[PDB]
Amino acid sequence: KNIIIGAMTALITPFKNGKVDEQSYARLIKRQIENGIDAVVPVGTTGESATLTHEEHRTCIEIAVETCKGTKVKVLAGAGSNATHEAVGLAKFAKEHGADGILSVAPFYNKPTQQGLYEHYKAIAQSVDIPVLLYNVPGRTGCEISTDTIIKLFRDCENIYGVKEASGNIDKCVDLLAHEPRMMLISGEDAINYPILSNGGKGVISVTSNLLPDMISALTHFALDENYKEAKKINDELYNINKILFCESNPIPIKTAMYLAGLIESLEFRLPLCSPSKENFAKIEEVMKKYKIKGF
Amino acid sequence: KNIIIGAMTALITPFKNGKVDEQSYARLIKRQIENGIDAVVPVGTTGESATLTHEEHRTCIEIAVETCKGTKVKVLAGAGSNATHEAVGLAKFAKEHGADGILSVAPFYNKPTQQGLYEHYKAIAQSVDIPVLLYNVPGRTGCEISTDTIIKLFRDCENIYGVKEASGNIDKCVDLLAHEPRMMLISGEDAINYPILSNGGKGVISVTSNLLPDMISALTHFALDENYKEAKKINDELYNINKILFCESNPIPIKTAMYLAGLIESLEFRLPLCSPSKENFAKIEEVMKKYKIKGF
Ligand SMILES: N[C@@H](CCCC[NH3+])C(=O)O
Ligand SMILES: N[C@@H](CCCC[NH3+])C(=O)O
């Protein structure tokens, strides 16, 4: 199976005057590349998938592919949708435009059954020939991809190679890899990056890495080499910032931190996302003071 | 405040060969009109908003408007989105094409803060001059519109007149009407229609009414006329069908029931939605036989 693993970043999508800031997007990706990141994920939850048009979604995938050209960094393109025909379209676009693989979030809002999730992902996987990583985040979607469904998809579809888990459920991570040790379990939850990796997870798709790519990168590669002492020390050091980046709904805190660090020009979200409370703004600024934030 | 209340139906969207069956849609609406229903809700969750294109979404609203033309039945158009620019577009279309009001589900998947929900709905309400009914269903969206946010929106925006609650939380329904008794609280949870109405709720937006419109309309009108003994008797009789219509995720069971009753031509969904299990299919069929289903 071909895979996309290692330290990976869920890219924020910067806006300027309501539009996608395209030179800022490329500069941010370059910064990720230069700080040891193995793959970038354009337009997932952290990239405000919901409020981008299908056109802008495709533009961000193109900038990501073009920027990683001539490097080892891969593009795991965000391509999920709660409509199977929409998810297949994004997957086909990502393949035709040079993505190395796709991330595909479980359908949100309409809550398909396990049978429906299976058929949803099989249709996506059969539409292209690049790796497909499932993405389970039940707190945001309202549905869960069960362990049985994940394992069935991995065994039944050649290009489905694993899952990004954002479920706060280390029991499920044991279940997954105890019954199907060939799959690539990816941490979707920065605070518990090390425990997932120490159980045989093979990478992370990180929010914190937007701000501290070098630290998340070192953590992941220490862990992959079974240097657990070093990996845990970094995971422990990162806990405070990992938690404060979800004081409000992601990506409101991470965009706030990137702006405070001078890495993006203006805060700016697209509604219904908005700027944090003054309290949380001050809390994010405080926690940031304890870390070294690389510039450009 | 101008309002839309009473017994209302979250319309299923029938498909034939994968496209919207517009003649079946109009025929089902007429069936609703003839059984005492006060308003219809095109393209909600029950109408598979997620998998309709923006254009089919608009077509369904138009059919509802024509079919209710010249009748006392109102059209409360499904116009929600997790992207504020999308929700404003749908709201303006509904207004421009003759809907009496709009339903607007809380943004799903991207989990805005309470401040974001306020700005989201303030933008929608300021875009049109027809009534706007908020819609809270946290099990599907991943977010909750707090009682404070609902009340602030009701008091601050002229056209925002109430909320459809599908949260299984009668405590919140007391909270809402104890602090703001002027709003229109609408039941979005069939099994507890009567308790919500008996606390001063003023209508239902029902899934069960697709199959038994006469019973749901009677229940609502009994309750509004303060005949709580008869409203409760119907709510109690309907409990079994009200629960079995959610044995799987709505609208998989209700479409299964409509097909079993001979009210739609084919049991077709759009992926990721699919047919129920064989077991569930048999369970829906067995419960249906205890009720009298109106024909055409
Ligand atoms: N509001 C839509 C936008 C999809 C198009 C861009 N990803 C959704 O969240 O599904
Ligand atoms: N699947 C997307 C697009 C729906 C557009 C038509 N209602 C969503 O749920 O937001």
Side-chain angles (χ1 to χ4, degrees), chain A residues 1-29 31-95 97-296, chain B residues 1-71 73-95 97-288 290-296:
Chain A
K1 283 194 187 246
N2 206 39
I3 64 183
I4 301 171
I5 63 171
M8 318 185 240
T9 298
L11 299 168
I12 59 152
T13 300
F15 296 121
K16 172 153 135 221
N17 298 131
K19 280 169 259 119
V20 172
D21 186 334
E22 295 179 22
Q23 329 153 278
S24 170
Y25 200 52
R27 190 189 182 136
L28 287 170
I29 292 176
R31 182 174 166 272
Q32 291 296 308
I33 294 173
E34 308 183 347
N35 280 289
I37 289 281
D38 295 296
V40 290
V41 181
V43 199
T45 326
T46 309
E48 286 167 89
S49 74
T51 55
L52 297 180
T53 69
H54 268 285
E55 308 91 77
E56 298 166 322
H57 193 140
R58 282 159 176 74
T59 293
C60 289
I61 291 174
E62 287 188 16
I63 298 170
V65 174
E66 185 70 20
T67 304
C68 290
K69 268 236 189 141
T71 75
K72 61 192 166 46
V73 184
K74 292 173 177 191
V75 173
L76 184 69
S81 180
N82 57 359
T84 301
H85 65 84
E86 256 175 280
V88 163
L90 290 161
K92 289 170 103 47
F93 177 93
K95 185 262 182 329
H97 288 264
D100 298 289
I102 60 162
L103 186 71
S104 196
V105 70
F108 38 90
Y109 184 49
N110 56 358
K111 204 179 176 203
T113 67
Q114 294 307 298
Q115 179 67 37
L117 287 171
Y118 181 89
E119 295 186 32
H120 171 83
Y121 280 123
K122 192 188 122 184
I124 289 156
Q126 287 181 157
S127 75
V128 296
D129 64 347
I130 54 170
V132 172
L133 194 83
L134 313 182
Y135 173 21
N136 186 58
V137 57
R140 292 296 191 76
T141 68
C143 82
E144 168 97 348
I145 323 179
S146 83
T147 286
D148 283 333
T149 302
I150 290 160
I151 296 181
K152 275 184 189 167
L153 287 165
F154 173 89
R155 297 180 176 165
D156 295 354
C157 303
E158 51 196 292
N159 39 349
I160 294 179
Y161 75 100
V163 56
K164 159 182 178 196
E165 276 291 339
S167 50
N169 188 345
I170 197 73
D171 178 290
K172 188 187 188 188
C173 296
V174 168
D175 189 14
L176 281 162
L177 292 190
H179 296 100
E180 190 34 271
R182 298 167 302 169
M183 86 169 63
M184 296 302 138
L185 173 68
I186 306 296
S187 174
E189 198 173 321
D190 275 302
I192 65 172
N193 279 338
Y194 164 76
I196 282 168
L197 290 172
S198 71
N199 193 233
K202 290 299 172 192
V204 307
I205 289 169
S206 173
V207 171
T208 302
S209 63
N210 278 278
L211 188 71
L212 315 164
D214 60 321
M215 297 183 74
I216 290 289
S217 183
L219 191 166
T220 305
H221 289 115
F222 273 130
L224 290 178
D225 284 349
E226 304 169 13
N227 292 132
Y228 294 153
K229 179 167 307 144
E230 295 89 335
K232 172 178 151 56
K233 179 185 167 202
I234 298 173
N235 198 77
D236 290 346
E237 282 174 359
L238 286 179
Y239 186 84
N240 282 350
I241 191 85
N242 286 338
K243 301 302 293 189
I244 211 64
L245 286 169
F246 294 80
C247 74
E248 300 193 16
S249 303
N250 175 62
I252 288 167
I254 190 53
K255 264 188 146 175
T256 301
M258 299 295 276
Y259 165 81
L260 274 160
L263 296 173
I264 62 179
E265 227 174 69
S266 57
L267 244 179
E268 289 208 47
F269 304 84
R270 273 191 194 167
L271 280 173
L273 289 191
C274 72
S275 210
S277 69
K278 317 298 219 294
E279 198 153 53
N280 283 332
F281 191 95
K283 283 176 181 182
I284 291 157
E285 183 173 23
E286 262 315 289
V287 190
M288 281 174 75
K289 280 175 181 169
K290 312 287 192 324
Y291 305 86
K292 297 287 211 287
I293 302 158
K294 287 231 218 160
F296 294 109
Chain B
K1 280 194 189 262
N2 278 111
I3 70 181
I4 301 167
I5 61 170
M8 317 179 235
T9 300
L11 300 165
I12 56 148
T13 299
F15 298 119
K16 192 175 170 166
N17 305 321
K19 350 128 314 216
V20 177
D21 186 333
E22 301 180 15
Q23 314 202 330
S24 182
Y25 201 60
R27 195 179 191 218
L28 295 168
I29 290 162
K30 199 224 199 234
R31 180 173 171 270
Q32 293 295 310
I33 296 175
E34 284 268 29
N35 283 284
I37 288 283
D38 297 310
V40 292
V41 181
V43 190
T45 325
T46 309
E48 290 171 80
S49 62
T51 53
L52 297 186
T53 70
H54 265 292
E55 281 304 274
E56 294 158 322
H57 192 145
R58 279 159 176 75
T59 294
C60 287
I61 299 171
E62 293 184 10
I63 294 169
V65 182
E66 201 26 70
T67 309
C68 296
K69 214 140 69 160
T71 68
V73 177
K74 292 174 175 297
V75 179
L76 182 73
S81 188
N82 58 359
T84 306
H85 64 80
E86 263 177 278
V88 164
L90 281 162
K92 299 175 98 213
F93 180 94
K95 146 69 173 177
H97 288 259
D100 300 278
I102 64 161
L103 184 84
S104 203
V105 65
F108 38 89
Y109 187 47
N110 52 4
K111 204 189 167 104
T113 66
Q114 292 309 302
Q115 177 73 38
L117 290 166
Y118 183 87
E119 291 183 33
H120 169 84
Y121 280 119
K122 183 176 157 196
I124 294 159
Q126 286 176 348
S127 87
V128 298
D129 68 354
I130 50 169
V132 176
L133 194 78
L134 320 172
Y135 171 19
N136 191 56
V137 53
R140 298 301 200 82
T141 66
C143 79
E144 167 104 352
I145 322 168
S146 85
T147 293
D148 281 337
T149 300
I150 292 165
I151 293 180
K152 267 184 185 165
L153 286 164
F154 174 88
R155 294 178 181 161
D156 290 2
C157 309
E158 308 260 14
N159 44 340
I160 295 186
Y161 76 100
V163 57
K164 170 187 155 130
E165 276 293 343
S167 52
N169 185 353
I170 200 71
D171 179 295
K172 182 183 191 194
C173 296
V174 177
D175 193 8
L176 283 160
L177 293 182
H179 296 106
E180 190 38 87
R182 298 170 296 180
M183 81 169 70
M184 297 307 130
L185 170 65
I186 301 300
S187 173
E189 195 169 333
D190 272 297
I192 64 172
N193 279 341
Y194 167 74
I196 285 171
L197 293 174
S198 74
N199 192 227
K202 291 301 178 200
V204 310
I205 288 166
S206 161
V207 175
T208 299
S209 58
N210 280 279
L211 186 78
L212 315 165
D214 53 316
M215 303 189 73
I216 290 288
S217 77
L219 188 165
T220 305
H221 298 137
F222 274 129
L224 288 179
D225 289 331
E226 304 182 287
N227 196 326
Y228 291 166
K229 177 187 189 211
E230 297 301 318
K232 172 186 153 55
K233 181 181 172 159
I234 294 179
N235 197 79
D236 289 343
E237 286 171 359
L238 290 180
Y239 186 80
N240 282 348
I241 183 81
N242 285 342
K243 294 309 287 191
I244 210 57
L245 286 171
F246 296 81
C247 69
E248 299 191 10
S249 299
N250 174 58
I252 291 172
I254 184 55
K255 266 185 154 178
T256 303
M258 300 292 283
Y259 167 75
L260 283 164
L263 296 163
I264 60 173
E265 188 146 39
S266 55
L267 192 47
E268 279 186 51
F269 305 88
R270 274 189 193 172
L271 279 178
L273 294 191
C274 63
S275 291
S277 80
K278 264 137 170 105
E279 173 188 62
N280 287 331
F281 194 97
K283 280 179 190 182
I284 294 149
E285 182 179 21
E286 190 190 27
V287 186
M288 278 171 77
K290 312 307 215 165
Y291 303 88
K292 294 207 221 200
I293 303 169
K294 297 300 251 259
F296 291 116

